[PDB]
Each structure stands twice: as structure tokens, then as C-alpha cells.
Ligand binder design. Structure first.
Ligand SMILES: [Mg+2]
Ligand SMILES: [Mg+2]
Ligand SMILES: [Mg+2]
Ligand SMILES: [Mg+2]
Ligand SMILES: [Mg+2]
Ligand SMILES: [Mg+2]
Ligand SMILES: [Mg+2]
Ligand SMILES: [Mg+2]
Ligand SMILES: [Mg+2]
Ligand SMILES: [Mg+2]
Ligand SMILES: [Mg+2]
Ligand SMILES: [Mg+2]
Ligand SMILES: [Mg+2]
Ligand SMILES: [Mg+2]
Ligand SMILES: [Mg+2]
Ligand SMILES: [Mg+2]
Ligand SMILES: [Mg+2]
Ligand SMILES: [Mg+2]
Ligand SMILES: [Mg+2]
Ligand SMILES: [Mg+2]
Ligand SMILES: [Mg+2]
Ligand SMILES: [Mg+2]
Lengths: 173, 96, 242
RNA sequence: AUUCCGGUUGAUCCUGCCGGAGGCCACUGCUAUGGGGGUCCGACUAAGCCAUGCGAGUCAAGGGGGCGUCCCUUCUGGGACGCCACCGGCGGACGGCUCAGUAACACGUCGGUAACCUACCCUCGGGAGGGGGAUAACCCCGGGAAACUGGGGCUAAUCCCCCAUAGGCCUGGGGUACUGGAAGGUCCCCAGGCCGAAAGGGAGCCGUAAGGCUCCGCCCGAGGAUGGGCCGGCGGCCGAUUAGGUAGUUGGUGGGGUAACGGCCCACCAAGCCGAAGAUCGGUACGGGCCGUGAGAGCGGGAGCCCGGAGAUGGACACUGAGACACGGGUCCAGGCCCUACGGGGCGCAGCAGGCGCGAAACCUCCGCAAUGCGGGAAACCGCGACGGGGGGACCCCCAGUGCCGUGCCUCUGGCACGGCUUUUCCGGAGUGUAAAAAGCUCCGGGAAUAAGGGCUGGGCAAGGCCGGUGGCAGCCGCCGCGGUAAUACCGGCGGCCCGAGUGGUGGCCACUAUUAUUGGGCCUAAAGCGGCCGUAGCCGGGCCCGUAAGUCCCUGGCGAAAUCCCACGGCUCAACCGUGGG
């Protein structure tokens, strides 16, 4: 036979030039300030996988099925994508925008640490943001609900000083 | 820097004690072996001649480092058990 | 093995009952021939180094063993390839600790702490029984050891019985028969590590193995092979079990 | 995403094939800042040929010697210490490499051996009595161009050989103690034979000595373990423009040989054995776990990691050993090549690097035994191109960069002008890291500074009806089709679109395809019902009652290695990757 070969984690469109899909994806890319299409596609694949797990477990029965069902629900609401009282059916109503709201770049922007999405990306990449006492430099990292409030400037960063000229401009917004 | 002892374990079969510790040091470089050894022998009343520092490791975006060291009750036992290279690296003996 | 016996063992092909990391390195210790078989034993080096953690590297593990710090069934073992198996007793007198080797609920070997007094006895399952020159009876136990008895007591011992032996003197002190109501502990198969009492025995023609039915504490009945049932007492266990 | 779009006509509806649009693999054009992880890199043609270095040793606690330094006395010596080769023991049958052969009990799976071998290891029961001998090392003399090799002298052993006892094997006659489902098996007693053990050796203390007390050892028997041998049932390619095949062939009886059963091989007696449910022969291939693709049913492949098989230039054959008809051991034939003083003597990298050749097609003549293991040793230890660490490479996967903010102007997407900010990346240092280094990680100084390309632009199919050349010429074109002096289609400029450290070309497999149809296609006129009928095997077969339990359904024991796949939790910054559990 053949040994294992590592495979891509995302899927490409079936047809590269469809006008409606191009327009929709362009709107998303502009709004969330992503670097290239593949990054976007990555998140899409994640969404699809969740749905494909929900569809398979609805039509199943037995002992392992219940365990996997509760594990899926717990994982989904640990990420902050579902409320605490959601049921399995609610999985089938998630959208691509729901996942994009959990990116570290977006959350840094929404919390008011930056004036713009691009500034948030630069702040993350250069190492000015700490999450739960740890510095992370990946703008696409998905933030868990339990750690969302412990996101601040790094304690060694120049921005961790309210008199810094650039921070005062950020606070002005 | 602040040194915090995580665990101390006794090994009667070898004749040594094994020490795990953390060093907290925001805005500072990774501590040197000499400083850590001095701090440890001050903190636990150890003979510096029979104390070896196995390693000091830093991490990606952390303000702290993790260290592992060993302390022997007899110098001859330490010479008989430990590899030669680790003794040279810690300055206990002299390379030829 | 084109021309002769094998001397090596890859990590990926190691027995499935060990607690070992299969991708950390390339090679594993090939066990020496000895008391138990491959499926129910582990080399002593892994007990010294990986299980108890008294050594970090193999070189300093061998230095500990050569000083005679480890006892298996009350005898000093220096070979790092020595196999240690089911129902054995591992004693460290310098630290004064004792363990018994037992299978897990999923079939892996673990060390169960025991008292010092219990460390002097070992149960042995009578695996076979034969006549030997001078008209004596030889008993062959499950771990490969042997014992001799006179022709007078030939009716006090049969296969599948359990003998409680005092180690290292190897002196018999108790015989536990295999019958309805005996207390058993399962060593292999799907129902490994479950314990209970014997209810029924069944037999089949043409050399197929025979099956026994066991009732546990909660009152459930389950079947297993007769040779996988290890007698440990009359109506209560005579040794500590997890 | 369980999908369609272009092409037959002046126009229409069909059948049917070709092309587009997706994934993966091999070669290749142009172009490239960084890090991490992994089972990637002379497999396809040549299992073709190979210069040089390395890839298997270890034991001084088995034994006599040589040399050196010291202490006691020393004429002489005796000690202790350290190196060296030799005799002797164990290992060199594993590990590493490649896929030529093989359609077969080779491989997968369930069983069997009551028909067999096993050095090293574990438990129990016993034994170690008496003799003998040579030789290496060392000294004298050598021969030969070398590869090699002769004579004489002297010596030891855990070296070799005898005698005894124990023990082993064969056959005949009794007794019934054991295991087992079942005794040509095990145990006991007589009888005739044949074969036939051992090293109380070594080391250290207490011993004045006597002798103990530990450590490592030698031989026999019973059983286990480890590694194998042999056998059976079932399962997995293509061809009828291959139809009959086999004569030690199939079976029986009596033997031989083997570790062991067997036409495995003989002597004699019979005519059997296989085959249209495909024998025989030919073709192509190492088998599997797995891998690619697809909604699934399926279709295609099986180099790299694990398990099994086979081979060492081609074809034959032996010695030693527990194990070989032995890759770095031996002999012959065939065919190449090398050194000779010409009489002779050597060598096959399908081990790691490296070279030539063949091609479209593939890297350094590097560092280390620190980790994981193996062999040797009582042990400390020694060796290992296995394994570990780096070097070269658009091998696969994961995470980033080529700036950000404020105010003005513009054609307001984007660019420009002012003012400010940061340092992932870049340059120079300290620590940590590592067998030693290098990467990586934490700090310090400088500075927007050091960093964007490839294809396309008539329709399918996102994007120009603009400018300049050429003029059925040059050229484009997967398909349909453009170009004949007013070209949105060729060449170039300026614009624009898609993806982006990548993007295009060529070949192969799956999908597209219900163009292989079990699910699920067709045959009046489009490809396709034998000119007609009778009938053998096969397949499909009316209603009720009783029985059985092979198919079929449900429950439960023993199995189908690990790696690979899915899920949750945990460790490397998250991830790729790795660990613990459930499937
Ligand atoms: Mg293969
Ligand atoms: Mg027509
Ligand atoms: Mg070749
Ligand atoms: Mg070999
Ligand atoms: Mg072939
Ligand atoms: Mg004799
Ligand atoms: Mg094949
Ligand atoms: Mg290969
Ligand atoms: Mg090379
Ligand atoms: Mg290549
Ligand atoms: Mg143009
Ligand atoms: Mg268009
Ligand atoms: Mg087609
Ligand atoms: Mg059709
Ligand atoms: Mg007709
Ligand atoms: Mg007709
Ligand atoms: Mg009927
Ligand atoms: Mg049935
Ligand atoms: Mg498995
Ligand atoms: Mg972490
Ligand atoms: Mg995680
Ligand atoms: Mg894993």
C-alpha cells in the first residue's frame, strides 16, 4: 500500500468564475480584511464540517451517538457560537459570519483596542496583544468564550501606557 | 527575577534530590546559569559544589522560564553517575 | 528472519499491553526468554525507568540494577531484559515498597500497591501435571516454574487449581480448588479484570476449549474461557485486588 | 453542490461522441522574504559497470609470553603497575539494501502437529572420580616480484583425547500410576544390544596456618519460554483467433531417507487424477495493512512507514555451526575487469557518501556514539554510515511578512503631500539552547527601512467596442472558430479580471458519464431480437397440512497486530504534530 500523506485543510470552489459567488466573497473579504481567498475558504470548511456532523447524528441511534452528540454541543457552545440552552437543530442555522466574529483580529477590533481592522492585525502580528497572560501572533486564532475578557495589551508593550501618543489616538474614537 | 519551587523529590536509590522551578522575569533576558545556581543554593542551603543545573528553558511568548536541577549528597557519587559533558557545561570540572 | 532468530524489535511492533510511546524512538527492548510469555509480561527496564521513574536514561537504570536494588519474587534480578508478568511481586527494600503486577480494565499491565505481609505469598495456577522418574508427580505452573510432590498426595492437585506459594523459599501453604462457588479473577479476553464467583461449567467435543460462567458482585452473569479464570479464594479473595 | 455548459440545421426536437469546469501523482517554463512539523528525494530506462574512505566487534576476573616504570632485597630474584600481539570464548545467520524471479500453500484468516528441531534465558531434581597429548606466542634458518608459505627447538589453559559412572536410543514380554476429547505419548518390573558427560575452573576477603564465606562459572534429566519447520479449509488478475491434459502421472502394499508426516525417493500391484462451474498453455505482476477519487453503490493503484516472501554479476555445489548451502566466508563453469619480474595472483556497492553510463527524470566523498537499541564483559565500559545531528532540494502540510494611524488634494477604489507610530521580517550584540555547533526562544541598539510575480482579456468563463502595426501574409485556435487594408479574437502600448510566494505547459488515474447501468441504460423507423423451431446443463417455478433446521434473523464466548481514519480532553504560542480515553 501507501503510507500517510498529509492533506489540505480547506476546499476550493467547484468553478472559479461564478459572478454571484465572486461578489459575495469580495464583500466578505473587504469587510473582515483577510489576506487571500484560501484563508476565507479555510473558515468555510470549518462551518461545513460542523453541519456534516449534525446531519449524521440526527439520523443515528445507539450509545456512542448520544456521547458524540453531547460532545458536539459542548464544543460548539464552548467556542461561544451557541447559547447555553441550544439544541442540536440550532447547529443547522449557523452562518459564515458567525465564525468570522470569533477571530482574534475581529475581537481585538470590537473590544476597542484598535481603531481599524488592519491596525488590529498589525498589533497582533507585532506582538502587542496578550490573551490570558500569553502572547499570540496568529490573527486567525479562534477565541474561546471563557478567556474573552482577559485580552489586553501585553504588559511589556509600549501601548501598555496611557500616555503613549498612539494609544491616545486610539482612545479618541 | 522571582524563583518559585514547584516540586522537590527524593531519590534514595541514586542518592540525590531533584528540583523543578519557575523563574518569572518580564522585560529581562533569560537568566544565566551562575545566577540561578547562586539563587538556588541561597534559597535551600545547598553546597554549590555538588549541585548541577540540568536545564533552563524559555518559551515562545512567556514572561517565565522553567528549570530543572539536581543535588547530590556525595561528590564521588555525583562523579560516578552524571555524564561528563553536563559537568563541563555547568563549570564543575575543567575540559581537557 | 531469513537465516536465523531475530534479535531486534521495532517500537511500532511492540506488544499492545505495554505503556510505551510508540513514535518517540525507533527501537524497543526485545525481552529475554523467561518466566511468562510475550503477551503477559514486560521487561524490567521499563518498570525501573518509565513506570516508577527512578532513572531518566537507560545507562543509569542499569547501574541501579547491577547494585541489586530490585527484588522480583524475593530474588535479586540484574538483567534489564528480564520479563515481569502477571501476579508477580516487585519489592524495593531500600525504599520499603511493594507492588503486584496486574492487568488493567483494558488489558494493560499496572502496578498495584500491596502490604509488606502480603508480599511474601504468590498464587500459581496449576497449568499441567505429569509423572516423572522415580514415580513422582511434577506440577507445571502458569509462569513456567515447576514443583515436585510424592505419589501419596496425587489426589490433592488437579489442573486449574491454585497454589499459594511462599517466596523465595518456594514452600506450599494452601490449595484452592476449582469448583462452583470459588472466587475468580479474569486475566485475558474481553472481560479482563472482572472478578466474581463460578456458577457453571460447560464442555464441548473434539478439543474445543471449555467455558465458565461467573456472577459478579452486582449479580450479573458473564461467560469466559476456563483457562482465563484465575482462582483467588474460596468465597472471598485471599489477596488484594483493585 | 446527489449540478451542468459549447458543438450537426435557414430554424426545431432527439440519439450519440468530442471539448470545457474539479481533485491527486510524475516531468517541466517563468518567478521567489520567514519560521515550524513530517513516515519526502537514482523506484519507472540499466537486478548496468564501479577509483578511493568507512559500514562487526568484544573479553586482562580463561592461558602462557614480550616491553616499560617503580618497591623489597637485589650477583640471581620476587612483587606491584601500565601497554602489546598470540592461543582461547562468545558474536559475525540480527541489523542495512533492492523488487529481478514467482499465478504458487507466496500472501491474508481460522485451525492442527498425538508427525518435529531450538545456543543464549527461567524453575525444580542430581553430578563434577582417574589418566594422557600436541601446538600458537617465543628462539635459529628461510623461500617468493608479490599474494602467500617451509624446516628445526620449547611451553600453558575454561584447548584436545582416553577410562569409569550417570545418561541416551532400538526391539520383545508384563503391570495399569498421569495428562487429554481421544494414547504408536509419560511412569513401574524383567530381557538382548548399541551409543556414551563434565572445567570445582577463575576472582576477593577472613585465614599464621588449616579451612571458610561470598561473586562469576562446567555436565545430565523433566518442563517452560524465545525463534522457526511442516499441514489443512476458506478468500483475492486477463485471454477460447489456447479444448483436451497427465504416465512417478493418481491410489495401494513393502522399504529407504529426513529433525519430522508425505511419490520426498525406490521395488512390486492396479488404472487412476484434472477439465466448458474453464483443465492445459500463454500474458502481466512480489502479497497485505493501506493510498487516490466519488453523495453513495463503485472504479483505479499498491515505490517510501509496519508485517510476510525472495536475491546478492548468471547457472550449479559444499565446509563449520544451535541456526547458512552464508551480501563485506569457500569451490566449479560462463562473461567482464585489474596487478605482474610473465612463472603467477586477485575483484563484482541491489550498505553510507562519491564517479561513469542510460535517460524527461533524483543530494554531502560532513560531525557523534550524548539519546534509542544490539553484540561482548562480573562491572566500570568499548564498537556500531543502525540510529541520532547538521549540509543541498519550489517533496507534503501548518502559521506569518512585503507596513499602520491622523489631516488635506486628486480622476476619490487608489495615488500624492505633510505629522506621528511599530519592528513580525532585516543588520550588530548578551543569555539560553546543543555531545560540540547551527537553528529556535527571552532581552538590548539602529531603522519604513530589506521584500511581487505568473496566467488571462470574442463565447463556454470573471475582465476593453480604446490606441498603433500586419493585411488569407505573419500568426492564433483544448472545442466552436478569428485573420482577404475600418481586426473588441494575431503583434505591441495603456487599461481591466482571477489567484497569489506562487502561477502556467505536457503525460496518467477518478469524477464529469445512467458513454458499462445490482441500485440504474438500451434494441419498429437512430448502434442493436439469431431466417424458424425442438431440446440437455443452468436460472426461474401453483394451493393446503405435518416434520427438520441447511440458508435467514436474534443473544452470547474466542479472533481479525501496531501505524493509518472520526470525536472530546490534555502538551509544544494556537495549528500541523504528539499523548490519554471512546468508536
Ligand atoms: Mg508494496
Ligand atoms: Mg442533420
Ligand atoms: Mg540502477
Ligand atoms: Mg542476513
Ligand atoms: Mg518483476
Ligand atoms: Mg566415554
Ligand atoms: Mg498486485
Ligand atoms: Mg525507495
Ligand atoms: Mg550519491
Ligand atoms: Mg524529481
Ligand atoms: Mg491585447
Ligand atoms: Mg463575462
Ligand atoms: Mg468526457
Ligand atoms: Mg444510451
Ligand atoms: Mg427474428
Ligand atoms: Mg433480423
Ligand atoms: Mg409455491
Ligand atoms: Mg441456520
Ligand atoms: Mg489496529
Ligand atoms: Mg500551551
Ligand atoms: Mg489543542
Ligand atoms: Mg498518536
Amino acid at each position: 500500500g501507501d503510507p500517510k500523506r498529509q492533506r489540505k485543510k480547506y476546499e476550493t470552489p467547484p468553478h472559479p468564475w461564478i459572478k454571484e459567488r465572486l461578489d459575495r466573497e469580495r464583500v466578505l473579504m473587504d469587510k473582515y480584511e483577510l489576506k487571500n481567498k484560501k484563508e476565507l475558504w479555510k473558515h468555510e470548511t470549518q462551518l461545513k464540517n460542523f453541519r456534516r456532523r449534525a446531519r449524521r447524528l440526527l439520523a443515528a441511534r445507539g450509545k456512542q451517538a448520544e456521547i458524540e452528540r453531547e460532545q458536539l454541543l459542548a464544543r460548539l457552545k464552548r467556542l461561544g457560537l451557541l447559547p447555553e440552552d441550544a439544541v442540536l437543530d440550532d447547529v443547522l442555522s449557523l452562518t459564515i459570519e458567525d465564525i468570522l466574529e470569533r477571530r482574534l483580529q475581529t475581537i481585538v477590533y470590537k473590544k476597542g483596542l484598535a481603531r481599524t481592522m488592519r491596525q488590529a492585525r498589525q498589533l497582533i502580528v507585532h506582538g502587542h496583544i496578550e490573551v490570558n497572560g500569553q502572547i499570540i501572533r496568529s490573527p486567525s486564532y479562534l477565541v474561546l468564550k471563557e478567556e474573552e475578557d482577559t485580552i489586553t495589551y501585553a504588559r511589556t508593550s509600549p501601548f501598555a501606557n496611557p500616555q503613549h501618543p498612539e494609544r491616545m489616538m486610539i482612545e479618541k474614537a | 527575577m522571582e524563583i518559585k519551587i514547584t516540586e522537590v523529590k527524593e531519590n534514595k536509590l541514586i542518592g540525590r534530590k531533584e528540583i523543578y522551578f519557575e523563574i518569572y522575569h518580564p522585560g529581562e533576558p533569560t537568566p544565566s546559569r551562575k545566577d540561578v545556581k547562586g539563587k538556588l543554593v541561597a534559597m535551600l542551603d545547598l553546597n554549590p559544589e555538588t549541585t548541577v543545573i540540568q536545564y533552563i528553558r524559555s518559551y515562545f511568548g512567556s514572561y517565565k522560564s522553567k528549570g530543572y536541577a539536581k543535588y547530590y549528597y556525595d561528590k564521588d557519587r555525583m562523579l560516578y553517575i552524571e555524564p561528563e559533558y553536563i559537568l563541563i557545561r555547568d563549570g564543575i570540572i575543567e575540559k581537557k | 528472519a531469513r537465516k536465523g532468530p531475530k534479535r531486534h524489535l521495532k517500537r511500532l511492533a511492540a506488544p499492545t499491553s505495554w505503556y510505551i510511546e510508540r513514535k518517540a524512538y525507533k527501537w524497543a527492548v526485545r525481552p529475554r526468554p523467561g518466566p511468562h510469555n510475550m503477551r503477559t509480561s514486560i521487561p524490567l527496564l521499563y518498570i525501573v525507568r518509565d513506570y516508577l521513574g527512578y532513572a531518566k536514561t537507560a545507562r543509569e537504570a542499569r547501574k541501579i540494577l547491577n547494585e541489586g536494588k530490585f527484588l522480583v519474587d524475593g530474588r535479586v534480578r540484574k538483567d534489564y531484559k528480564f520479563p515481569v508478568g502477571i501476579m508477580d511481586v516487585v519489592s524495593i527494600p531500600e525504599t520499603g515498597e511493594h507492588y503486584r503486577v496486574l492487568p488493567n480494565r483494558i488489558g494493560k499491565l499496572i502496578l498495584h500497591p500491596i502490604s509488606e505481609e502480603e508480599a511474601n505469598i504468590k498464587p500459581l495456577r496449576i497449568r499441567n501435571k505429569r509423572m516423572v522418574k522415580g514415580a513422582k508427580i511434577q506440577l507445571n505452573f502458569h509462569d513456567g516454574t515447576n514443583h515436585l510432590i510424592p505419589l501419596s498426595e496425587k489426589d490433592n492437585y488437579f489442573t486449574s487449581y491454585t497454589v499459594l506459594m511462599k517466596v523465595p523459599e518456594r514452600e506450599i501453604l494452601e490449595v484452592l480448588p476449582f469448583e462452583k462457588g470459588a472466587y475468580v479473577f479474569v486475566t485475558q479476553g474481553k472481560n479482563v479484570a472482572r472478578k466474581g464467583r463460578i456458577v457453571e461449567i460447560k464442555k464441548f467435543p473434539m478439543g474445543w476449549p471449555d467455558v465458565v460462567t461467573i456472577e459478579d458482585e452486582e449479580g450479573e452473569l458473564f461467560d469466559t474461557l476456563k483457562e482465563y479464570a484465575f482462582v483467588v479464594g474460596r468465597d472471598k479473595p485471599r489477596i488484594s485486588l483493585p
